[PDB]
Design a protein around this ligand. Structure first.
Ligand SMILES: O=C(O)Cc1cc(-c2ccc(C(=O)O)s2)sc1-c1ccc(-c2sc(-c3ccc(C(=O)O)s3)cc2CC(=O)O)s1
Ligand SMILES: O=C(O)Cc1cc(-c2ccc(C(=O)O)s2)sc1-c1ccc(-c2sc(-c3ccc(C(=O)O)s3)cc2CC(=O)O)s1
Ligand SMILES: O=C(O)Cc1cc(-c2ccc(C(=O)O)s2)sc1-c1ccc(-c2sc(-c3ccc(C(=O)O)s3)cc2CC(=O)O)s1
Ligand SMILES: O=C(O)Cc1cc(-c2ccc(C(=O)O)s2)sc1-c1ccc(-c2sc(-c3ccc(C(=O)O)s3)cc2CC(=O)O)s1
Lengths: 55, 55, 55, 55, 55, 55, 55, 55, 55, 55
């Protein structure tokens, strides 16, 4: 076989899960957050996949 | 087989799940948030997939 | 087989779920949010798939 | 088989769900929000798929 | 088989659900929002699929 | 102060919420159920406050 | 002060929430159930407060 | 002070929450269940407060 | 002070939370269950407070 | 002071949390369960407070 990509690719066979991202956010997984009190200014309480590039 | 992509591709066979994103947000997964009190200015309480690029 | 894409594609066979996004938001998954009090100015309380690019 | 796309495509066979988006928003999934009080100016209380690009 | 698209297409067989969007909004999924009080100026209380590109 | 009750009482001051029940059911709280398919014979799908005393 | 009860009482001061139950069910709290498929005969899918005394 | 109870009492001062139960079920707390597939005959999927006394 | 109870009592002062139960179930706490697939006959998947006295 | 109980009592002062139980189940605490696949016949997957007295 032959393949040429510029990116971003994701090429496969017999594949149970696939995610391609440029951005941005993708949530595909099981996630449970239980929480009782959030205070403070300002605290990232429960972050799973996170990116902060403030300018 | 032969394939040429510019991106972003996601090419496969026999594949249970697929996500392609440029952006942007995609939520495809099970997610449960239970929460009782959020305060503060300003706190990211429960973030799963998150991207902040303020300018 | 043969395939040429410019992107964004999502090409497959025998595939249970598919999402293609450029944007933008796509919500296809099970999601439960239970919440009792949100305060503060301004706090992202419960974000699942999120993108903030304010200029 | 043969396929050439410019994007955004989503090509498949035997496929239970499909979403193609350029925009924009698509909501196809089960979603339950129960909520008791929202205050503050201005707090994104419960966001599932979200994109904010204010200029 | 043979297929050439400009996008946005969504081509399939044996497929339970399909959405194609350029825009715009599409709501096809089960959604329950129960809510008791919304205040503040101005807070996105419960957003499922959302896109804000104010200029 | 003085108080004598036989029950069921609920005596208070400065009190935001009150429920007295003998029975029977009382629903006073925020509740959101979103649901897509219920089958089976016979399955309690989503029960919040529940009592079954079949004889 | 003086108090004599037979039960069930609930006596208080300065009290934000109160529930008295003999029965029976009382739902006063925030609750969100999101659900996609229930099968089987017969399975209690999502039970929060539950009592089964079949005879 | 003086108090004589037969039960079940709940006597207090300056008290934020109170529950008295004989039964029966009481749900006063924040609860989020997100769920995608329930099968089997018969499986208690997600039980929070639960009592089964079948005879 | 003086107190005589038969039970079940719960006597206090300056008390943030109180639960009295004979039964039965009481759910007052924050709880988040996220779940993707339940099978089998019959498996208690996610039980928090649970009592099974089948006869 | 003087106190005589038959049980079950719970007598206190200046007390943040209280639970009295005869039964039965009481859930007052923060709890997060995230889960992806449950199989088998029959396996207690995730049990926090649990009692099984089958006869
Ligand atoms: O609002 C728009 O104008 C954006 C926009 C509008 C579209 C419309 C389609 C139909 C429309 C109609 O019909 O009206 S409008 S598509 C689209 C975008 C796609 C991808 C974008 C990306 S991808 C990326 C990075 C990738 C990798 C990085 C690293 O590694 O740093 S950064 C940034 C951006 C943007 C940014 O600068 O934030 S914007
Ligand atoms: O970068 C920041 O400064 C903003 C910022 C920064 C935070 C940090 C947290 C931890 C940090 C650390 O630890 O470093 S930083 S939270 C936060 C914001 C929350 C909500 C905002 C809203 S909500 C809204 C509208 C809602 C409804 C409208 C209608 O109807 O028009 S407009 C606008 C905005 C903003 C705007 O465009 O003005 S900004
Ligand atoms: O003790 C057991 O055997 C029962 C049992 C044992 C399990 C184990 C799991 C792991 C174990 C291990 O690892 O050891 S054991 S799960 C389970 C049951 C689930 C649901 C049941 C239902 S649901 C229902 C009705 C619903 C609706 C009705 C209407 O409308 O009348 S009646 C009745 C029953 C039962 C009945 O009274 O018959 S029993
Ligand atoms: O259905 C009923 O008949 C029971 C029932 C019915 C009532 C009604 C009220 C108004 C009604 C109307 O108006 O119609 S009916 S109250 C009540 C019960 C309270 C407490 C009970 C307990 S407490 C306990 C244990 C405590 C500790 C143990 C260890 O350590 O082993 S076991 C068991 C039981 C029961 C059991 O054997 O399962 S049952």
């Amino acid at each position: 076989k032959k393949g040429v990509v510029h990116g971003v690719a994701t090429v496969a066979e017999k594949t149970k899960e696939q995610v391609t991202n440029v951005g941005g956010a993708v949530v595909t997984g099981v996630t449970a957050v239980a929480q009782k009190t959030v205070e403070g200014a300002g605290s990232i309480a429960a972050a799973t996949g996170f990116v902060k590039k403030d300018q």
